[PDB]
């Protein structure tokens, strides 16, 4: 209900808590026992990397579907930043996808 949405460009501090919405582009399976999966999420503000922690015990994210993340923390990653999903965070399936560009303008005719 009226969640505090934050844009990717707005994120510039680590440990920052807030909600983030994005589209799933591609996910790579991790052979590490700690990290479960790692990938990148598309968004009108750009692309953000994310890592799923097993301690979260949350359902796997589906490709080509939008999701709303709430109560998440930004982790430190090399020169960039990423969002870490934990049990405290929540994931909800959105029936509305995120538009990142149609690459072309269409019209009725």
From TrEMBL:
Span within the parent record? 67 to 166 of 421
Q: Identify the species of origin.
A: Methanosarcina mazei (strain ATCC BAA-159 / DSM 3647 / Goe1 / Go1 / JCM 11833 / OCM 88) (Methanosarcina frisia)
Specify the protein name: Conserved protein
